[PDB]
Each structure stands twice: as structure tokens, then as C-alpha cells.
């Protein structure tokens, strides 16, 4: 299942992220990709020879913007570094 934050377990590793169709060209023998700082970035599906990019699914900080309780109790919430769809 693609384009969803899922709990994936490919051949030898596991993780949570968003599996998308990639534009990378893996070598016929290579199996796993990596980012610069030793981070899983792409995986070849053991069944279809497709290259899938792994994007970690949305998360961020939640900050409460409130006036002082001596003034009001109505608040406003800031979902850091996400778009207004996944919330």
C-alpha cells in the first residue's frame, strides 16, 4: 500500500513511513538504499522489482497559543511542520 504512513517490514529491516514510487535506478544486485547520514531511504520490493522511497510520515510539535487565563480561556493550537490535511 502506497502513499500512506504504514508499518512496513521488508526482507531484513522494519520501519514506519510513506512508501512512494521512486525515480531512482538501483543496481540489479543492490537491495537497500541509504541517505548521507546512514538512514534508510529506498527499498527494492522483494516481489516486484520496484524502487520505493521511504518518507517518514507526518509528525511535529504541538504548541498552544493562548492569551493569559486572566484575560480569556479561548485558545489556538499550532501543529508544527505539517499541512492541514493530516490533522
Amino acid at each position: 500500500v502506497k502513499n500512506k504512513c504504514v508499518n512496513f517490514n521488508f526482507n531484513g529491516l522494519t520501519g514506519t513511513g510513506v512508501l512512494t514510487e521512486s525515480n531512482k535506478k538501483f543496481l540489479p544486485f543492490q537491495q537497500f538504499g541509504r541517505d548521507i547520514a546512514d538512514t534508510t531511504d529506498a527499498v527494492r520490493d522483494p516481489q516486484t522489482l520496484e524502487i520505493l522511497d521511504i518518507t517518514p510520515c507526518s509528525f511535529g510539535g504541538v504548541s498552544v497559543i493562548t492569551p493569559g487565563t486572566n484575560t480569556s480561556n479561548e485558545v489556538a493550537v499550532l501543529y508544527q511542520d505539517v499541512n492541514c490535511t493530516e490533522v
Binding site: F26, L27, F29, Q30, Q31, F32, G33, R34, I36
Partner: peptide, 23 residues
């Protein structure tokens, strides 16, 4: 009979793809 193996003998250490990186 001896020769200079200039720079040869380098094989991929693993099955891990990497890109534009010095590993």
C-alpha cells in the same frame, strides 16, 4: 615476474546503494 597492481581490486563492500557520498 612482478607487476604494479596500480589501483585495481576494489569491490562493493555490501549490497547497499548509496549516492553522491563518500563512504
Amino acid at each position: 615476474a612482478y607487476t604494479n597492481s596500480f589501483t585495481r581490486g576494489v569491490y562493493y563492500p555490501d549490497k547497499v546503494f548509496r549516492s553522491s557520498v563518500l563512504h
